[PDB]
Amino acid sequence: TTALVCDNGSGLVKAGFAGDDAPRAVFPSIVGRPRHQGVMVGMGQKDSYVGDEAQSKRGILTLKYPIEHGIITNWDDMEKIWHHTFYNELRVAPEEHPTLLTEAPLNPKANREKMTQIMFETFNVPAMYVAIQAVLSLYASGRTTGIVLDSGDGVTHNVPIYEGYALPHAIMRLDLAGRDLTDYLMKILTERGYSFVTTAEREIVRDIKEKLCYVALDFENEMATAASSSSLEKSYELPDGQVITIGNERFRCPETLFQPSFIGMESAGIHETTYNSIMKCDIDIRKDLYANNVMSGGTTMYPGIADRMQKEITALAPSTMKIKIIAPPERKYSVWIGGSILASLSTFQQMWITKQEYDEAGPSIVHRKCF
């Protein structure tokens, strides 16, 4: 029987069948509930919406995100999201298909414990497994040696690997991701006058961010140019016909990745965090990691991010090293593609957690049979 690969991200769900080369369904991880009153008898139905139907009717709803900062926080909505996925997106009964789930490293253990408990008790899957996202990202790239950098919607973590042996003491995780940039951009758009506060208009600001934002290769030069010239300005149209114009906000918004002090956080930028993660590895394997930086996740889709990372790491590492940034165009779905590859492998079939194993050992097993 064909297994199911389900990557519940903080921003998007990527679910489908093992063996494909792309997710079958991709819909935002939100659940909406009406806030106005219904008056037209026989209409105004379905007090909750999930995914794209909720997105379309967002004009009258408060949109709730179940997964925050990569730690699940609202289990009812998440069971609802899983049910919608299986029964309306994939349209396949979950109880007949082995399942593969993903989680970020350094995550609360109760997270995966209850994640296993739900999948076994409610959906009755024959077996299941949980795999660190960065391992899957490295599988998608066919490499056995790389320092994965995955930057999703709420989290951003590095995982240094060498010939298949991970280095769990060299793992860094950073709570700075796309939603933080969305909020900061919503905060700096009021600096021109365009005020967005709602849960709906946060989606407009996110769409603006996707549409226009880019990373400056030398921040001060772009700041000076924008302050002294108008070739960088750009205009975007809201759903009600208004047209907003944004100037240097385009490259100020993504810059939080490299200077988290824009939002007040203390941590060092992504570049310095990756270099530090490399420096924690044995002397004999810093060379290989310096040349196998594998990116992933949505937030790493900004133009100029790859060149900026290459520059900002080569500035730190010794001159004689060869920094190489690898960023395939498909990196928005790299974790899921790796998950598909991993679930397909014949030698992997001996590693699932089965229903009877769960019956004997309960959720606690998921830590022993999954790193």
Q: Which of residues 330-349 bind ligand ADP (CB under 6 A)?
A: 332
The two three-digit tokens of residue 324, written as one number: 């190489």
Residue 245 CA to residue 175 CA, distance in Å, equals 30
Say if residue 276 is exposed, middle or buried (CB neighbours under 10 Å; 0-12, 13-18, 19+): middle
- Residue 91: CB minimum distance to a second copy, A: 26
Single-letter amino acid code for the residue at 315: A
Q: Which CB sits closer to a second copy, 24 or 369? A: 369
Residue 51 interacts with ligand ADP (CB under 6 A): yes or no: no
Residue 297 interacts with Mg ion (CB under 5 A): yes or no: yes
Taken in order 167, 68, 118, 5, the sign of the CA dihedral is negative
Residues 49, 57 contacting (CB under 8 angstroms): yes
From the list Mg ion, a second copy, ligand ADP, none, pick the one residue 368 interacts with, judged by a Cβ distance below 5 to 8 Å according to partner type: none
157-195 CB burial, b ≥16 within 10 A, e <16: bbbbbbeeebbeebbbbbebbbbbbbebbbeebeeeebe
Residue 172 CA to residue 69 CA, distance in Å, equals 15
Q: How many CB atoms lie within 10 A of CB 142?
A: 8
Residue 175 interacts with a second copy (CB under 8 A): yes or no: yes
The residue assigned the tokens 């194993």 is 357
Q: Angle at Cα 110 formed by Cα 106 and Cα 115, nearest 5°?
A: 100
Single-letter amino acid code for the residue at 179: R
Residue 234 three-state SS: strand
Residue 306 interacts with a second copy (CB under 8 A): yes or no: no
Residue 210 interacts with a second copy (CB under 8 A): yes or no: no
**Binding segment toward Mg ion, per CB under 5 A, in 59-67, 139-147, 294-302, 351-359:** 294-302
Segment 220 to 279, residues that bind a second copy, using CB under 8 A = 237-242, 261, 263-264, 266-267
x/- letters, 23..62, toward a second copy (CB under 8 A): -----------xxxxxxxxxxxx-----------xxxx-x
Single-letter amino acid code for the residue at 289: L
Q: CB under 8 Å to 56, separation ≥6 — which residues?
A: none
Segment 82 to 101, residues that bind ligand ADP, using CB under 6 A = none
Q: Which CB sits closer to ligand ADP, 69 or 83? A: 69
**Binding segment toward a second copy, per CB under 8 A, in 79-87, 314-322, 325-333, 352-360:** 314-322
Among 16, 28, 152, 339, binds Mg ion (CB under 5 A): 152
From the list a second copy, Mg ion, ligand ADP, none, pick the one residue 230 interacts with, judged by a Cβ distance below 5 to 8 Å according to partner type: none
**Binding segment toward ligand ADP, per CB under 6 A, in 55-63, 90-98, 147-155, 341-349:** 147-155
Q: Which residues are at the interface with ligand ADP (CB under 6 A)? A: 9-12, 152-154, 178-179, 182, 206, 209-210, 213, 297-299, 301-302, 332
